[PDB]
RNA sequence: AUUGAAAAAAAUAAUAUAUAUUAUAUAUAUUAAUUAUAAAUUGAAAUAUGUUUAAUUGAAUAUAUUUUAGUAAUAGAUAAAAAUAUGUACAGUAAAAUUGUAAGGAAAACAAUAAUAACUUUCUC
C-alpha cells in the first residue's frame, strides 16, 4: 500500500453505472430472488391470507373512522435545535441536540387513506439464558421457534460480557426470527385462538406496554411454548422449552393506534392506558 | 463419542439444516419461461388494481367523513364536538373475530349477556 | 336544516372470502411450485426408529425406484438422499374423530332469506329498511333533542326498534357521511356501528340484510351513488 | 381478442416459429418444448403442474388490458404519446417477449424483431440501458475520452463498430479494446441503433473519430486528430449499418487515415462519436449542410468548435485504442504516410 | 465445563447458489371449541386436530356469549346447588 | 438415436467439436450440473427371481442385487457476537441515549426512535 487516502473521483455524465451488471462473475446472482432463474427463488403468494383479508375488509376503514381528528395538522417531533447566531462561536457549530431526548423523534402525522395502522413485522427473541452453560440448549430454542414459525430462525450470540451473571462474549445463546407477511399472519392467528387462551390468568397485553411509536410487546413462558400444535402433538419430543419476547411492529404513528389495531385481530388489553 | 441427549441435539439441528434434504434446481424450457413470466406480471397488476381500488374507496371515505364534519361544524356545534373526541383506548369487541375457513356448528348467536 | 340520523349496520363475514377463478388456479400454482421445491420430510426426526407409529407411516408411504446398476432410467438416473427423488415434488400421505367442516353455503342461503343473519358467511351484510313508500335506505331517525351524542342517539333508537333483540357496537362517534337535499330542509348524518350478536325483527314496513351488489339493486340510483364506497365490497 | 389480428398490427408481433406458438397455446399440457431438441431431454423433462389454464387467463386479462389501450392510442393525434401507448398495449404480450428475449438484437432479422416497431425499439433500449451503455460509459470515463474530446455524453443511439476488411474476421469491438495496427489499417464499419421516436426520412447523422492522444512538442502536449469523418448519413431503425455501400463519396468529409501510434508516444484513444443533424422545419427531405473542407484541418481538431459550429448533438460514442506495434510501419508505407517518430522511453 | 457441539468444516455456499429453506409443510385442518374448522400450515404430520381449550370457549375472548374425573366416579352413589347450600355456613371463617 | 406424449432454425452464456487472424474470434450441435465426496453384523427403500392368496394385477412373504441412513448449523455478496491483522474487487454504516418486552433486576437479549421537495417506473381517479 502507497497510501490510505480515500478519495472518489468526480464523473461527467449522468448515467448510473451498476457495476454488478458490467462484471461476468456472479451470473446467478444478477437476477433478482422473485425471479424464476435465480436459485433464491421462493414461492411468496402460496395461498390466500386470512388475517390480512380480514384486515383488508372490515378493520382498514374502521380504524380510519375512528382515527380521523378534524382538521388535525402535523405534530412535529423532537428534533436538533439550531443555535441563534448571537455570536460568531454559533458560525460552524454542530445544532444542539434535541430538548428532552439525546436522539431525533419523529413527526407524528394525521391518519389519513394512505398511512393507516397495520401490520408491519413480528419478531420472536428466544435468548435461553441456561445456554451459558449448555450450547445444546440455543440449538434445541431454535429448533422450536421453527416448528413454532415455520421460519428459519438466526442464532443469538451473547454480545456483552459480565461476571454477575456467568455469561462470557460470542457465545450462542437462543434465537430470532423475523416473520413478515402470510407466516407472521398465521402466528398471530395461531397466538390469539389457540395459545392465549390456554394460558390459565392471562389477563391480557399490557396497555403500558410499546414503544413511543407504533410498537407492541409480550412474552410467553416456558408453561406457555406447550400450547402450540406443533410442540403439544409430540411432547416425548419436546422435553425442555424455552420462553421467549414477541416484538409486534405496526405501521402505527403512536402506539394507542397500535394497541387499537391489535385489538382488532382478538388480542385482550388490560391495563390502565398511559 | 455422543450421548443420546447430542444426538437428539444432532437430530434437532437437522430437521432444521438444508443438508441433503432439498431437491433439484427448478428448471423451465423457454417457452414454459415466459409462460411463467406473464403468469406473475399479470398476477401483480391484478394486485396492483385491488390495492387501487381499495386505497380509492378509503379515500374517498375519508372524503365523505371530511364532508361530514364540516357540515356538522357549520350547523351543531355540541353534536360536533361530540363527534370529534379522543378515541385514544378505543378497543375493537371481542365478538368481531377474524373470520375462519369453515362457519362453526351455531353460526349466530340470537341471545346474548 | 333539520339534523337526523342515518344508520347502517354491519354484520361482517364469519369465514374466508370465496376466491376469484384467477386467483384459485393461480395460488393451486404456486403451491406446487412449492411442493417442487419443497426439502424432504425428515422422517426420522418426527417418527422414531422401532416404533409402533413410525411403521404405520411407513405403510402409508410408498418409496421412490433407486439407481440399479445395467439398466436405462429413459427419465435420467435416481438421484435420492434421505429417500426422495431430488429430481421430483415429494408427497407424504398420512376424541378420536374424523375432522369434518360444516358446509358453507346455508339453509337461509339456499332458501333466499332476506331477514336472515346467516344467508351469507363471506360477505359483509348491511341492514336496509323500506319506508312507507316503495324505497328502500339505511335507517333513518328524527335528532329532537339534541342532548346526547349522535352515535349514541342512533343506537338507543335502533335498541327501541328491536325491542332489545339487536347488540351493536359503535366503531366511532365520528360520522361516515351526510345525505343532503333542497326539497326537504334536513340533513342525515350517518353513523357506522356493527352487530355483534341478536335478531332486529321490528315507521318501517320490512327490513332485509344485504351485500353491496345486492342493494344497488334494491335502493335508489342516487342514493346508491351518495352511499357506495362507505359499503365494503366483499 | 387483440393480440390475434393482424389487420392492421404488424407481422412481428407474432411468433414466426409455428410449434413454439401450438406449445404457447394449448388446452392441454400434452406437446413437449420446442426449445429442447433432442428426445430423451424432452423425456425427461417435467413442466411445473397446472401451468396452463393459469397462463391462459393471464394471457386473456393481459390482451383485454391491450385492447383498452388500443381503445386509446387510435383517437390520439400526437407521435410520442401514441408510441408510448402502442407500447403500453403490446410489452405485455407473451410472443413479442419470446421474439425478442431469444434472438439475437444486434443484428437483428425484421420479421421476428422489428424496430420499425415501438415495443421491440423500447425492448431494444430497454436492453442496452441494462448493460452496453453503462458499459459504454464507464469507458468514457475511465479512458478520460469525454472531457478531453467532447464535455458530456447522453447515451440514446447504441454504437457498435467492426473492422471486416483489414483482416478477414468477423467481430465487434468491445469498448476500450486494444486493436491491432493490422486490425485498424483499413476503415470500420459503424452500426447506429437509434431508440427513440425519430423522423427516419428528415433526420441526417454525422460521425467523426478523432484521436486525441497525438503528441505536439512544441506545445509539449498532446493534439486532437480527426481521424475519419463522415457526413449526413441517413439511417433507419433496420437498416442501420454505414458501410462503403450505403454513405456516398461527398459524405466523406475526412477519409479514414488508420492508427499509427509513435514507439514510446503511448497508448491512443480512438473515439468515435455519433451526432444527429439540426432538423428544419418547413422543408420537406432531408436538410444536408456544406462543411468548409479548408477551414477544418486533420492534424489539429477543435471537436467541440465543429459541433458549435454545425450546431450538432452527440448521441452515441465508441472508443477503442491502439498503441505502436512492428506493423505500424507497414501500415504506414501501404498508406504512403511518412517514417514514423520515435521517442525516449522515459518520460523525464 | 461448558458443553458444545464441536463444529466441523463450514460447506461453502457460493454467491448466488444459496436458495431459500422451503421447509416441508402439511395442510392441517384445526377445528376449534365449536365446529369451526380453519386451515393452517403445519412442520408436523398431522392432516387433522381438534382442540378443546380455545378462544371460542374461552370468556375472556366472548363475554357476550383426571383427578376430578376420578371423583365423579368413586362419588358418583352419593351424587354429592343443593349440597352447596346445605355445607355452606359463613359465619365461622 | 432407441423409449414417453399426441422438414428444421433464427438470443446471452456455458459445454463439445472444427477452423479463421501476427484480432481470446466465428461456425455447427446441445442446454448438463448447482450443496455433493471413503468407511455402516442393526434402520428404511427399490428392482430382479421364487412361493402363496383374490392367464391377470393387487396383497403377503423369502433370497439376491443395489440404493439410501454417517442424520451437524453459513442458504446471505452475510455487514459492528466471536473467528485469517498483508493484496485486490464489490458493498454497507457505527455508537450513545431513550421507550418497551418471559425469568431480566443499574448491569444479559430483541425490537423500535430525523426529513421526502424534486426525479424514474408501475397501477389508478
Known sequence: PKSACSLVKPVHHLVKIDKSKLSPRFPELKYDKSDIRSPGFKPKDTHADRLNDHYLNTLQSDLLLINYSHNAAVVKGLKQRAWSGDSPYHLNRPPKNPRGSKAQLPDIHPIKWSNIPGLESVVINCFVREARENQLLAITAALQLQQITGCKPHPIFSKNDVPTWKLRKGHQMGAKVELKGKEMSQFLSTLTEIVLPRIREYKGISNQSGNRFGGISFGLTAEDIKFFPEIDANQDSWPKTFGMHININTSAQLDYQARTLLSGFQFPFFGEEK | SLSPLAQRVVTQLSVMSASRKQPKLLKLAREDLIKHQTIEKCWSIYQQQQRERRNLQLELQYKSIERSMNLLQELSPRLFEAANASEKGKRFPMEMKVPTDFPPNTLWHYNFR | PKIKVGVLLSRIPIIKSELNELEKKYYEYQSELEKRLMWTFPAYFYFKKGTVAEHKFLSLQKGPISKKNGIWFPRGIPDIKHGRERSTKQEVKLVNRPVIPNDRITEADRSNDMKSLERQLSRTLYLLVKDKSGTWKFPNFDLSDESKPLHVHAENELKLLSGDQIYTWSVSATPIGVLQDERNRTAEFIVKSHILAGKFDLAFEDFAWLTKGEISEYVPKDYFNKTEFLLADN | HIWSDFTTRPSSLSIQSSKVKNYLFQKKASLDPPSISRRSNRIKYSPPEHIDEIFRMSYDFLEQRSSKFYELANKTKNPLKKDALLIKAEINNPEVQYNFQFNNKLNNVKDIIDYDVPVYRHLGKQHWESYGQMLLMQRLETLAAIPDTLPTLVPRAEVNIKFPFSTGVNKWIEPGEFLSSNVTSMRPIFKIQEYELVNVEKQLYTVLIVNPDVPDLSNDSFKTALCYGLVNINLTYNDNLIDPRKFHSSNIIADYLPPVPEKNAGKQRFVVWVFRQPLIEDKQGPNMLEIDRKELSRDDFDIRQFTKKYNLTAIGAHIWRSEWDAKVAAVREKYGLPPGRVFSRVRR | ?93
Open chain 5, 1 to 93: 465445563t461448558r458443553i458444545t457441539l464441536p463444529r466441523r468444516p463450514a460447506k461453502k455456499i457460493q454467491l448466488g447458489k444459496s436458495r431459500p429453506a422451503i421447509y416441508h409443510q402439511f395442510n392441517v385442518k384445526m377445528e376449534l371449541s365449536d365446529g369451526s374448522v380453519v386451515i393452517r400450515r403445519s412442520q408436523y404430520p398431522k392432516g387433522e386436530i381438534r382442540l378443546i381449550q380455545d378462544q371460542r370457549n374461552n370468556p375472556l375472548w366472548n363475554p357476550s356469549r383426571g383427578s376430578l374425573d376420578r371423583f365423579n366416579k368413586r362419588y358418583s352413589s352419593l351424587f354429592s346447588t343443593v349440597e352447596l347450600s346445605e355445607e355452606n355456613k359463613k359465619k365461622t371463617q
